[PDB]
Amino acid sequence: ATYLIGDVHGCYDELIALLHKVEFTPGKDTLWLTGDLVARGPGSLDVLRYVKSLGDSVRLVLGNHDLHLLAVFAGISRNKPKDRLTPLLEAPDADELLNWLRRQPLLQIDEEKKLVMAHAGITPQWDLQTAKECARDVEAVLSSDSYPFFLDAMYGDMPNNWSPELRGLGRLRFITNAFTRMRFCFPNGQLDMYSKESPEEAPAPLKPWFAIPGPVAEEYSIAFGHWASLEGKGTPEGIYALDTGCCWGGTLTCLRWEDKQYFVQPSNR
Ligand SMILES: [Mn+2]
Ligand SMILES: [Mn+2]
Known part of the structure; x- marks a missing residue:
């Protein structure tokens, strides 16, 4: 069976309880995770150990908090007390875990299921070939020995409009923002980097990225977390918003793909 779970955010107990609810069995089942595995919840260390142990039975995409953790580890960014990352950063296997984490994809595609996953979704300004190329480029910098320099370069809110002519720092910043920070778009598809409200509370003319028809969403289902x-x-048909706010006191949500059946684990707070 195929299971998709939204943002775990260090909620290790809830994750394990939800996987036991569906009798998740590596080797017979596969788990997709929308990223943001770490921060806020208490168990980022155990979450990372477990997900890494799953190997090929898990398909992860990296989220904005995963990238922030990597920036802290690399000495690029300051640790925030509220993120509760110190046990993970001080763990004897922190190097092993974070070197594995930075090698994980930004985008997952399954052609037999016609299914696409990224942390924040797929901007309507991208077709599938471009999304794949951009994911490959950022994964290449994150997998390289020089990843601290990329992590430093990634911070920024511009440019917010895609063009195949974008080069260098602006290209990498947009790719990063589209995959891991996107929520709202302007009518032309341009990213808004400020509003984090629900669609009903957002200011005009902002609309959710998935409310703007785009070539990927016309052919593929898209699963995402983040928001x-x-x-x-x-969300429209074919769009699966899996982040139900477990770390925030909401729930952890799991979707079984074969029958589109949902399983929910309440947050423990
Ligand atoms: Mn996120
Ligand atoms: Mn999140």
């Missing part, structure tokens, strides 16, 4: 204020609701 907690969306609460997993309000």
Whole structure:
């Protein structure tokens, strides 16, 4: 069976309980995770150990908090007390875990299921070939010995409009923002980097990225996490918003793909 779970955010107990609910069995089952495995919840260390141990039974994409953790580890960015990352950063296997984490994809595609996953979704300004090329380029910098320099370069809110002519720092910044920070778009597809509200509370003319028809979403289903204020609701057919805010006191959501059946684990707070 195929299971898809939204943002775990260090909620190790809830993750394990939800996987026991569906009797997840590596080797017979595969798990997709929308990223943001770490921060906020108490168990980032155990979450990373377990997900890494799953090997080929898990298909992960990296989220914005996974990237922030990598930036802290590399000495690029400052640790925030509220993220509760110190046990993981001080663990004897931190190097092993974070070197594995930075090698994980930004984008997962399954052609037999016609299914695409990224942390924040697929910007309507991208077709599938471009999304794949951009994911490959950022994965290449993150997998390289020089990844601290990329992590430093990635910070920024511009440019917010895609063009195949983008080069260098602006290209990498847009790719990073589209995959891991996107929520709202302007009518022309341009990213808005500020509003994190639910679609009903957002200012005009902002619309959710998935409300703008795009070539990937016309052919593929898209699963994503990231957007907690969306609460997993309000999406069109073929769009699966899996982040129901477990770390925030919401729920951890798991979707079984074969029958589109949902399983929910309440947050423990
Ligand atoms: Mn996120
Ligand atoms: Mn998140």
